[PDB]
Design an enzyme around this catalytic site. Structure first.
Site, PDB file in Angstrom:
ATOM      1  N   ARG A  64      -2.857  11.255   5.986  1.00 27.49           N
ATOM      2  CA  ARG A  64      -3.087   9.873   6.399  1.00 27.49           C
ATOM      3  C   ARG A  64      -2.592   8.840   5.389  1.00 27.49           C
ATOM      4  NH1 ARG A  64      -6.707   5.964   5.388  1.00 27.49           N
ATOM      5  NH2 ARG A  64      -8.387   7.193   4.405  1.00 27.49           N
ATOM      6  N   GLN A  95      -7.690  15.284   2.783  1.00 27.55           N
ATOM      7  CA  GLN A  95      -7.078  14.338   1.887  1.00 27.55           C
ATOM      8  C   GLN A  95      -7.771  14.106   0.554  1.00 27.55           C
ATOM      9  OE1 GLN A  95      -6.389   9.664   2.474  1.00 27.55           O
ATOM     10  NE2 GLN A  95      -4.547  10.937   2.790  1.00 27.55           N
ATOM     11  N   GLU A 155      -6.554   1.985  -3.855  1.00 29.04           N
ATOM     12  CA  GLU A 155      -5.131   2.134  -3.923  1.00 29.04           C
ATOM     13  C   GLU A 155      -4.560   0.685  -3.913  1.00 29.04           C
ATOM     14  OE1 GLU A 155      -1.804   4.103  -0.760  1.00 29.04           O
ATOM     15  OE2 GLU A 155      -3.183   5.288  -2.034  1.00 29.04           O
ATOM     16  N   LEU A 160     -14.625   5.638  -5.432  1.00 28.61           N
ATOM     17  CA  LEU A 160     -13.253   5.266  -5.190  1.00 28.61           C
ATOM     18  C   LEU A 160     -12.790   4.000  -5.927  1.00 28.61           C
ATOM     19  CD1 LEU A 160     -10.696   5.742  -3.084  1.00 28.61           C
ATOM     20  CD2 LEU A 160     -11.560   3.536  -2.356  1.00 28.61           C
ATOM     21  N   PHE A 177       0.864  -1.170   0.000  1.00 33.00           N
ATOM     22  CA  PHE A 177       0.000   0.000   0.000  1.00 33.00           C
ATOM     23  C   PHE A 177       0.908   1.229   0.000  1.00 33.00           C
ATOM     24  CE2 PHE A 177      -4.283   1.704   0.946  1.00 33.00           C
ATOM     25  CZ  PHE A 177      -5.032   0.735   0.298  1.00 33.00           C
ATOM     26  N   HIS A 214      -7.820  11.693  -2.467  1.00 32.27           N
ATOM     27  CA  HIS A 214      -7.379  10.340  -2.835  1.00 32.27           C
ATOM     28  C   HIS A 214      -7.018  10.438  -4.328  1.00 32.27           C
ATOM     29  CE1 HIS A 214      -7.395   6.053  -3.831  1.00 32.27           C
ATOM     30  NE2 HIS A 214      -7.534   5.751  -2.550  1.00 32.27           N
ATOM     31  N   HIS A 260     -11.587  12.838  -0.182  1.00 28.14           N
ATOM     32  CA  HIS A 260     -11.817  11.520   0.346  1.00 28.14           C
ATOM     33  C   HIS A 260     -11.874  11.338   1.869  1.00 28.14           C
ATOM     34  CE1 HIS A 260     -11.202   7.105   0.267  1.00 28.14           C
ATOM     35  NE2 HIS A 260     -10.187   7.263   1.098  1.00 28.14           N
ATOM     36  N   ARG A 308      -0.266   9.714  -0.495  1.00 28.12           N
ATOM     37  CA  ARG A 308      -1.370  10.286  -1.240  1.00 28.12           C
ATOM     38  C   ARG A 308      -1.227  11.752  -1.569  1.00 28.12           C
ATOM     39  NH1 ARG A 308      -6.193   6.936   1.629  1.00 28.12           N
ATOM     40  NH2 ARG A 308      -5.937   4.999   0.411  1.00 28.12           N
TER      41      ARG A 308
HETATM   42  C1  LIG Z   1     -15.166   7.255   1.612  1.00 28.98           C
HETATM   43  C2  LIG Z   1     -14.228   6.061   1.635  1.00 28.98           C
HETATM   44  C3  LIG Z   1     -13.319   6.006   2.733  1.00 28.98           C
HETATM   45  C4  LIG Z   1     -12.404   4.932   2.888  1.00 28.98           C
HETATM   46  C5  LIG Z   1     -12.380   3.860   1.907  1.00 28.98           C
HETATM   47  C6  LIG Z   1     -13.276   3.886   0.779  1.00 28.98           C
HETATM   48  C7  LIG Z   1     -14.207   4.978   0.634  1.00 28.98           C
HETATM   49  C8  LIG Z   1     -15.122   4.897  -0.565  1.00 28.98           C
HETATM   50  N1  LIG Z   1     -11.511   2.794   2.064  1.00 28.98           N
HETATM   51  C9  LIG Z   1     -10.619   2.656   3.152  1.00 28.98           C
HETATM   52  C10 LIG Z   1      -9.732   1.497   3.351  1.00 28.98           C
HETATM   53  O1  LIG Z   1      -9.709   0.562   2.587  1.00 28.98           O
HETATM   54  N2  LIG Z   1      -8.891   1.445   4.470  1.00 28.98           N
HETATM   55  C11 LIG Z   1      -8.885   2.534   5.424  1.00 28.98           C
HETATM   56  O2  LIG Z   1      -8.112   2.523   6.393  1.00 28.98           O
HETATM   57  N3  LIG Z   1      -9.721   3.594   5.234  1.00 28.98           N
HETATM   58  C12 LIG Z   1     -10.571   3.685   4.151  1.00 28.98           C
HETATM   59  N4  LIG Z   1     -11.492   4.811   3.988  1.00 28.98           N
HETATM   60  C13 LIG Z   1     -11.499   5.874   5.066  1.00 28.98           C
HETATM   61  C14 LIG Z   1     -12.250   5.231   6.227  1.00 28.98           C
HETATM   62  O3  LIG Z   1     -13.072   4.218   5.668  1.00 28.98           O
HETATM   63  C15 LIG Z   1     -13.190   6.105   7.005  1.00 28.98           C
HETATM   64  O4  LIG Z   1     -12.370   7.098   7.505  1.00 28.98           O
HETATM   65  C16 LIG Z   1     -13.797   5.260   8.172  1.00 28.98           C
HETATM   66  O5  LIG Z   1     -14.734   4.355   7.609  1.00 28.98           O
HETATM   67  C17 LIG Z   1     -14.485   6.080   9.267  1.00 28.98           C
HETATM   68  O6  LIG Z   1     -15.600   5.507   9.862  1.00 28.98           O
HETATM   69  P1  LIG Z   1     -16.225   6.062  11.156  1.00 28.98           P
HETATM   70  O7  LIG Z   1     -16.532   4.975  12.104  1.00 28.98           O
HETATM   71  O8  LIG Z   1     -15.360   7.170  11.661  1.00 28.98           O
HETATM   72  O9  LIG Z   1     -17.689   6.442  10.506  1.00 28.98           O
HETATM   73  P2  LIG Z   1     -18.487   6.311   9.305  1.00 28.98           P
HETATM   74  O10 LIG Z   1     -18.354   5.019   8.885  1.00 28.98           O
HETATM   75  O11 LIG Z   1     -18.347   7.325   8.400  1.00 28.98           O
HETATM   76  O12 LIG Z   1     -19.854   6.335  10.055  1.00 28.98           O
HETATM   77  C18 LIG Z   1     -20.400   7.497  10.742  1.00 28.98           C
HETATM   78  C19 LIG Z   1     -21.498   7.094  11.692  1.00 28.98           C
HETATM   79  O13 LIG Z   1     -21.993   8.252  12.389  1.00 28.98           O
HETATM   80  C20 LIG Z   1     -23.357   8.370  12.225  1.00 28.98           C
HETATM   81  N5  LIG Z   1     -23.797   9.790  12.260  1.00 28.98           N
HETATM   82  C21 LIG Z   1     -23.342  10.827  11.545  1.00 28.98           C
HETATM   83  N6  LIG Z   1     -24.014  11.924  11.846  1.00 28.98           N
HETATM   84  C22 LIG Z   1     -24.899  11.566  12.758  1.00 28.98           C
HETATM   85  C23 LIG Z   1     -25.922  12.249  13.461  1.00 28.98           C
HETATM   86  N7  LIG Z   1     -26.135  13.513  13.203  1.00 28.98           N
HETATM   87  N8  LIG Z   1     -26.717  11.602  14.400  1.00 28.98           N
HETATM   88  C24 LIG Z   1     -26.535  10.259  14.665  1.00 28.98           C
HETATM   89  N9  LIG Z   1     -25.555   9.555  13.973  1.00 28.98           N
HETATM   90  C25 LIG Z   1     -24.764  10.197  13.048  1.00 28.98           C
HETATM   91  C26 LIG Z   1     -23.748   7.639  10.972  1.00 28.98           C
HETATM   92  O14 LIG Z   1     -25.060   7.038  11.020  1.00 28.98           O
HETATM   93  C27 LIG Z   1     -22.691   6.497  10.977  1.00 28.98           C
HETATM   94  O15 LIG Z   1     -23.144   5.282  11.563  1.00 28.98           O
HETATM   95  O1  LIG Z   2      -8.419   5.383   2.570  1.00 27.29           O
HETATM   96  C1  LIG Z   2      -7.728   4.323   2.675  1.00 27.29           C
HETATM   97  O2  LIG Z   2      -7.062   4.127   3.721  1.00 27.29           O
HETATM   98  C2  LIG Z   2      -7.716   3.338   1.713  1.00 27.29           C
HETATM   99  C3  LIG Z   2      -8.553   3.488   0.508  1.00 27.29           C
HETATM  100  O3  LIG Z   2      -9.316   4.711   0.220  1.00 27.29           O
HETATM  101  C4  LIG Z   2      -8.365   2.568  -0.637  1.00 27.29           C
HETATM  102  O4  LIG Z   2      -8.826   1.384  -0.593  1.00 27.29           O
HETATM  103  O5  LIG Z   2      -7.728   3.003  -1.649  1.00 27.29           O
END
Ligand SMILES: *Cc1cc2c(cc1C)nc1c(=O)[nH]c(=O)nc-1n2C[C@H](O)[C@H](O)[C@H](O)COP(=O)(O)OP(=O)(O)OC[C@H]1O[C@@H](n2cnc3c(N)ncnc32)[C@H](O)[C@@H]1O
Ligand SMILES: O=C([O-])CC(=O)C(=O)O
Ligand code: HEM
Ligand SMILES: CCCCCCO[C@@H]1O[C@H](CO)[C@@H](O)[C@H](O)[C@H]1O
Ligand SMILES: CC1=C(C(=O)Nc2ccccc2)SCCO1
Ligand code: SF4
Ligand code: F3S
Ligand code: FES
Ligand SMILES: [K+]
Ligand SMILES: [K+]
Lengths: 239, 613, 101, 140
Positions: free
Chosen positions: B400, B243, B258, B255, B122, B245, B356, B289
């Site tokens: 990140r 960030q 990577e 997305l 990665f 991506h 992203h 990134r």
């Molecule tokens: C966008 C993205 C990010 C990503 C990725 C692929 C995409 C398309 N792939 C990744 C990967 O392979 N490896 C990695 O380390 N990171 C990767 N990312 C980034 C990462 O996935 C995100 O940073 C991570 O998923 C963060 O998750 P977190 O637990 O912080 O939250 P979330 O999944 O976004 O969920 C948010 C929750 O909060 C609730 N929410 C939001 N607002 C409210 C309000 N107002 N009231 C009550 N609840 C709320 C949502 O319902 C949700 O459950």
């Molecule tokens: O955000 C990450 O850590 C990883 C991610 O978007 C990817 O699968 O390319």
């Protein structure tokens, strides 16, 4: 040089209960809209009627949120290409035979509870060493999970099954039964017999009559009908 | 009020969010004996985490020998020294344990010939403290790791008595004496208002990528938790670090992992040149990134973009064996076909840098506790925790590393739980709140419900997204940032003229999206004002008018005889931002980066150095 | 404990039997086949309508009523067929005669 | 925390007493050959069953024996075309059910589940039904 497409969408407002469900037509210029039905739905809500209501979150067909019935079939709006034939009106309805919360939003709580009822989690006879070392799984055994673990629990399959329409209170339905199969064949799970024993009744598993609407409608290309057939074979031969 | 029915709940703990972090914190609290509530606006498995692809980092050593301190080092350098080394230390050291836990929960990791967890290369990870070549420590479930991590954690949570309040929108924190005592929220299914009182509150609400016009983020990533902290008068941190991506698919924005480059894919321009060989001789397409995104942006600026508009570049995978594409990248194989009509075994995918992830968020210490900064000293906010993309621990600093976010979620989701359990006891008395606590949240909610102004929500949101897209992108400059700031300030003042149409209360998404717009705008204001003030280039924040990274010393030269720069005269420090919600005025302050690790003897601090890939 | 899978298995076995009785009726008309068909046709049919009832009839009373009726129909049906095999030409022969018209 | 069973019960208590409508199903779902064949397999099975029951009841209630009614029919000298048609109508449902039934038994062995095989096997069952029925109507 616009390309006006018509969408007829199911409407029902819980706050004005008395108004019976009706269909509302919207005209959308495809030259100013993304290619998927969800794009049109969001464009309508942002520019034509902000009261139109539906669930959505990911835009790439992975979250499972936007499931609905478009042109007669259950599918994800975010990955469903709009039909560019301007002479045809696309009809959009909530997932079939479900209680409507509002507009295109169905109540999925029975669906989730059925999913909870089959204990979709890894169970080993002795869990006290949990967290210490990776459990070993061969490539060949891991491959058995392909086609099963990809389910996004959208409920397109279950709400397309006539048996689930007539007996959704007791028939677990294709999505849940396939996830039950997914834990049954996970080489790391030690509760296979018990998972099978849970289906020893007339409804849970046995309302399936191999109609195969479930497999035809899955937006992820999975085959729960086949998975259900594999459970029936195990139910017939296990000790 | 009196017009909205109010329901009160008493719990030991309240978790806002059901993504990877929220769920891990929530059942972690329940497994420790705490009566816990998990309030989420979405059914859990619909959270953005479900869309993660590439994987999660851990020095398990399944592919070649590894060392968590090497992962520590890659993360410190990757953050461009804005990362707090005590938290990075905790995260990388806990990583192997965290991944093993998930697999023992049943996460269907892909496998090696020995039956262990398959790990891929990665971006920005090396062996031997950056001296030994590419590490392969990104554990994955093909290219649907997020989907499996979330579904696995959701199934696990089903084993505990955590009380879930699904499709409830959190509006604000219930603060009293500088202490948090719960949250107030709206039940979307029936329109009622609920107050969750608790001795401890955990914010796990995700990021705010939706403030931009183009993003890989879900429509639901609206920074709701960050906005609640801002409304309580608390600071957010490093919000200007956004960030981009390198590979969001052209058009749709979805997305493309990577992991594609980790498995051998390469980026090419319109001349067919593998240009990263020129921008990062050693790392190439696996550089960090911030560097790959800037490089791709330069290729496009300099006329080597592809397509009829020469506005994107290509991601090439067809030179790889089709069995490897089907086994390691089946998810993007389908996505490429659905959204670009591309068959990856034959043609390249059209891609472009896309918003992203948010490095900034609510400031916390390495234990997950939210902090404020008064009279030059960090101070804990009693009863308030944050984890996940919504928090700034800060393990990611100014950039990140791919696959460190999913790691961050389970590690700190778990740490918040641990910290609360080693700090409080289940059953202790629930803190009190005034009888009208939360009334201003309900009044604001009522104000938007009946808004009959002149600017509808979608109009103002689009304005905000276009301003950010064109005034705070990959490369930035003082005058463009300033015009963007004034544009956002005006849009913020114009929220007084909002117009909504749905007058109902049950599933009124017209209303919920207006609340999310207020949240998005507070995040955006802080992001752009903070960017305009930071006159240096560090990690993801690139100033063409201030191209150098400005530290307390010039670390490109020998420190011997150097004169240390006063705190007010350099930029190696975290930005703390505040907003006067009625006016929209943004105030900026600064706090020092933490360089000490958790044990100098076991993992020594990494001093700032020139950063190159 | 395995009543459900056992029943499912029985239903398939009986379906298979019927299948084999078709060729048998053509190659070896007579009492053996005539009575086997009477039994298989009744059983396969009873279970089949039984599945139809389970699918569409709901409510504890309506279901008990529907199943009592089915049982009554099956009994009469098996009786009539055996009676016909006994006092008349029999199923196999009746079919050949009918097809000679 | 609530158990799956308690959630299911509240789900029904809540909705049956609500004003929420049930979304359309049968009137808006798009048909497919496999779905139609499925209803048809059930339709032929029930028809076949009612046929056997009716005959069984006629044998127990009618005055004369079988050969008698056969003779009566032969004596009317009906058009062979009409009789051929009647033979077709009689054997059709049984032929359909028999071939489709075999299709079901092959599924129970876990074979033929790919969407392409499902569509193909259904078309084969329709052809076999028409051939055998036409062959038998002209006697055997
Ligand atoms: C966008 C993205 C990010 C990503 C990725 C692929 C995409 C398309 N792939 C990744 C990967 O392979 N490896 C990695 O380390 N990171 C990767 N990312 C980034 C990462 O996935 C995100 O940073 C991570 O998923 C963060 O998750 P977190 O637990 O912080 O939250 P979330 O999944 O976004 O969920 C948010 C929750 O909060 C609730 N929410 C939001 N607002 C409210 C309000 N107002 N009231 C009550 N609840 C709320 C949502 O319902 C949700 O459950
Ligand atoms: O955000 C990450 O850590 C990883 C991610 O978007 C990817 O699968 O390319
Ligand atoms: C004479 C026959 C009669 C009276 C008859 C009657 C029935 C009935 C009433 C059903 C239930 C219909 C449904 O549930 O949709 C049925 C189902 C079935 N029959 Fe027959 N049948 C006859 C012969 C056969 C033969 C020769 C075979 C082979 C066969 C195979 C099947 C199968 C496999 C089913 C189960 C369908 C499923 O899986 O849902 N039948 N039949
Ligand atoms: C009136 C009975 C005729 C059966 C209706 C056929 O319906 C057709 O079946 C094919 C094959 O499954 C599908 O691909 C078509 O979309 C569907 O309209
Ligand atoms: C429940 C079931 C059938 C069913 O009810 N099908 C159906 C009914 C109405 C409308 C469409 C299909 S047909 C095959 C046996 O199982
Ligand atoms: S099997 Fe397919 S249709 Fe059914 S829930 Fe899973 S993804 Fe959706
Ligand atoms: S449509 Fe229904 S009947 Fe069985 S094969 Fe699929 S679950
Ligand atoms: S919005 Fe996520 S599946 Fe369509
Ligand atoms: K097993
Ligand atoms: K963050």
């Amino acid at each position: 040089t616009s390309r006006i497409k018509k969408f007829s969408i199911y409407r029902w407002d819980p706050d004005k209960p008395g108004d019976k469900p009706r269909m509302q037509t919207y005209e959308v210029d495809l030259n100013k809209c993304g290619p998927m039905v969800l794009d049109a739905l969001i464009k309508i809500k942002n520019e034509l009627d902000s009261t139109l209501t539906f669930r959505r979150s990911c835009r790439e067909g992975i979250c499972g949120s936007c499931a609905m019935n478009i042109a007669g079939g259950n599918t994800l709006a975010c990955t469903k290409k709009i039909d560019p034939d301007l002479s045809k009106t696309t009809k959009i309805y909530p997932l079939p035979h479900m209680y409507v919360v509002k507009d295109l939003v169905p109540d999925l709580s029975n669906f989730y509870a059925q999913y909870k009822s089959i204990e979709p989690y890894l169970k080993k006879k002795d869990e006290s060493k949990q967290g210490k070392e990776q459990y070993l799984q061969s490539i060949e055994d891991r491959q058995k999970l392909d086609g099963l673990y990809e389910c996004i629990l959208c409920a397109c399959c279950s709400t397309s099954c006539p048996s689930y329409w007539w007996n959704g209170d007791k028939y677990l339905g294709p999505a849940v039964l396939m996830q039950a199969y997914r834990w049954m064949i996970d080489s790391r799970d030690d509760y296979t017999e018990e998972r099978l024993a849970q289906l020893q009744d007339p409804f849970s598993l046995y309302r399936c009559h191999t109609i195969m609407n479930c497999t035809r409608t899955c937006p992820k290309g999975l085959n729960p009908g086949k998975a259900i057939a594999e459970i029936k074979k195990m139910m017939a031969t296990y000790k | 009020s009196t017009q909205y029915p109010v329901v009160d709940h008493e719990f030991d703990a309240v978790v806002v969010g059901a993504g990877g972090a929220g769920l891990r914190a929530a059942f972690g609290l329940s497994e420790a004996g705490f009566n816990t509530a998990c309030v989420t606006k979405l059914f859990p498995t619909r959270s953005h985490t479900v869309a993660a692809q590439g994987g999660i980092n851990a020095a398990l050593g399944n592919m070649e020998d590894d060392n968590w301190r090497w992962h520590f080092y890659d993360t410190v350098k990757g953050s461009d020294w804005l990362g707090d080394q005590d938290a990075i230390h905790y995260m990388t050291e806990q990583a192997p344990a965290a991944v093993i836990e998930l697999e023992n929960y049943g996460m269907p990791f892909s496998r090696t010939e020995e039956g262990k967890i398959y790990q891929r290369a990665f971006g920005g990870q090396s062996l031997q403290f950056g001296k030994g070549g590419q590490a392969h420590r990104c554990c994955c479930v093909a290219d649907r790791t997020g989907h499996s991590l979330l579904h696995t954690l959701y199934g696990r949570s089903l084993r505990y008595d955590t009380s879930y309040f699904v499709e409830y929108f959190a509006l604000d924190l219930l603060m009293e004496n500088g202490e948090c005592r719960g949250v107030i929220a709206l039940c979307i299914e029936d329109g009622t208002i609920h107050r969750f009182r608790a001795k401890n509150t955990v914010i796990a609400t995700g990021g705010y990528g939706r403030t931009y016009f183009s993003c890989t983020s879900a429509h639901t990533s609206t920074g709701d938790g960050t906005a609640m902290v801002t409304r309580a008068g608390l600071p957010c941190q490093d919000l200007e670090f956004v960030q981009f991506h390198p590979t969001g698919i052209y058009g749709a924005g979805c997305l493309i992992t990577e992991g594609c480059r980790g498995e051998g894919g390469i980026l090419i321009n319109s001349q067919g040149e593998r240009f990263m060989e020129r921008y990062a001789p050693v790392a190439k397409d696996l550089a960090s990134r911030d560097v790959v995104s800037r490089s791709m942006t330069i290729e496009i600026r300099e006329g080597r973009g592809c397509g009829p508009e020469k506005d994107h570049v290509y991601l090439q995978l067809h030179h790889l064996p089709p069995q490897q594409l089907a086994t390691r990248l089946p998810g993007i194989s389908e996505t490429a076909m659905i959204f670009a009509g591309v068959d990856v075994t034959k043609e390249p995918i059209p891609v472009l840098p896309t918003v992203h992830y948010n490095m900034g968020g609510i400031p916390t210490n390495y234990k997950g506790q939210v902090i404020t900064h008064v009279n030059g000293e960090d101070k804990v906010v009693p009863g308030l925790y944050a984890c996940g993309e919504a928090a700034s621990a800060s393990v990611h600093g100014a950039n990140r590393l791919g696959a460190n976010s999913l790691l961050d979620l389970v590690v700190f989701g778990r740490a918040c739980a641990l910290t609360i359990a080693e700090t409080c006891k289940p059953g202790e008395p629930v803190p009190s709140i005034k009888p009208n606590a939360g009334e201003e949240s309900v009044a604001n909610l009522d104000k938007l419900r009946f808004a009959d102004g002149t600017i509808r929500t979608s109009e103002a949101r689009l304005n905000m997204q276009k301003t950010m897209q064109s005034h705070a992108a990959v490369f930035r400059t003082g005058s463009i940032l300033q015009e963007g700031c004034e544009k956002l300030s005006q849009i913020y003042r114009d929220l007084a003229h909002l117009k909504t149409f749905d007058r109902g209360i049950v599933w009124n998404t017209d209303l919920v999206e207006t609340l999310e717009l207020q949240n998005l705008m507070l995040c955006a204001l802080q992001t752009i004002y903070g960017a305009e003030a930071r006159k240096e280039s560090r990690g993801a924040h690139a100033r063409e008018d201030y191209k150098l990274r400005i530290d307390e010393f010039d670390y490109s030269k020998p420190l011997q005889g150097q004169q240390k720069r006063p705190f007010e005269e350099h930029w190696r420090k975290h930005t703390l931002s505040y907003v006067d919600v009625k006016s929209g005025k943004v105030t900026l302050k600064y706090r020092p980066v933490i360089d000490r690790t958790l044990n100098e003897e076991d993992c020594s601090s990494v001093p700032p150095a020139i950063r190159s890939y | 404990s395995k009543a459900a899978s056992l029943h499912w298995t029985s239903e398939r076995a009986v379906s298979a039997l019927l299948l084999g009785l078709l060729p048998a009726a053509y190659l070896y008309p007579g009492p053996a086949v005539d009575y086997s068909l009477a039994a298989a046709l009744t059983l396969h049919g009873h279970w089949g309508l039984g599945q139809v009832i389970t699918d569409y009839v709901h409510g504890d009373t309506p279901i008990k009523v529907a199943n009592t009726g089915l049982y009554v129909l099956s009994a009469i049906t098996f009786t009539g067929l055996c009676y016909f095999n006994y006092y008349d030409v029999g199923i196999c022969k009746a079919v050949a005669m009918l097809w000679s018209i | 925390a609530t158990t799956a069973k308690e959630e299911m019960a509240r789900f029904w208590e809540k909705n049956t007493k609500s004003s929420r409508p049930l979304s359309p199903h049968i009137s808006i779902y798009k048909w497919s050959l496999p779905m139609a064949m499925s209803i048809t397999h059930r339709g032929t099975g029930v028809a076949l069953s009612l046929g056997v029951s009716l005959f069984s009841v006629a044998a127990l209630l009618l005055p004369e024996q079988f050969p008698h009614y056969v003779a009566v029919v032969k004596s009317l000298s009906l058009s062979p075309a009409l009789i051929y048609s009647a033979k077709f109508a009689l054997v059709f449902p049984l032929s359909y059910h028999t071939w489709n039934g075999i299709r079901h038994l092959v599924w129970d062995m876990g074979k033929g589940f790919k969407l392409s095989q499902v569509e193909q096997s259904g078309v084969v069952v329709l052809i076999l039904t028409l051939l055998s029925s036409a062959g038998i109507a002209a006697i055997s």
